[PDB]
């Protein structure tokens with residue numbers, strides 16, 4: 179079964195809007211979203227759909243770009259580093275669950291390099 183997806187709202191959490199967070203949504207997230215390798219990462223891993231009973235047995239801090247996008251739209255984050263950490267968790271989860279050379283790992287490796295390129299242009 180699927181655990182609940184990561185929260186995208188938390189009324190007691192303190193929140194911020196910064197120019198860097200705006201850029202993370204407008205440029206980083208929305209450009210990576212359009213990449214030809216982005217599709218596996220656009221929503222939480224659905225272990226029922228994918229017949230993956232051990233995905234959430236192995237991955238304890240799941241993360242995906244749909245969650246990140248919703249978090250940015252809801253101003254969920256305090257700073258850009260907190261959002262950047264979610265991207266890094268998404269990529270590392272993919273390496274943890276899969277194997278070197280797998281198609282999904284090649285996709286994450288390409289997306290991670292593009293992500294780092296865009297982070298260098300943070301205002």
Ligand SMILES: Cc1cc(C)cc(Nc2cccc(-c3c(C)nnn3C3CCN(C(=N)N)CC3)n2)c1
Pocket residue numbers: 217218219223224228230272275276280281282
């Ligand atoms: C057979 C296949 C290959 C590929 C490249 C993608 C898919 N579809 C999707 C859709 C949404 C998320 C994922 C995903 C993420 C994120 N992280 N891992 N995955 C899977 C886990 C199981 N898996 C395996 N080889 N046991 C493949 C990679 N994959 C299915």
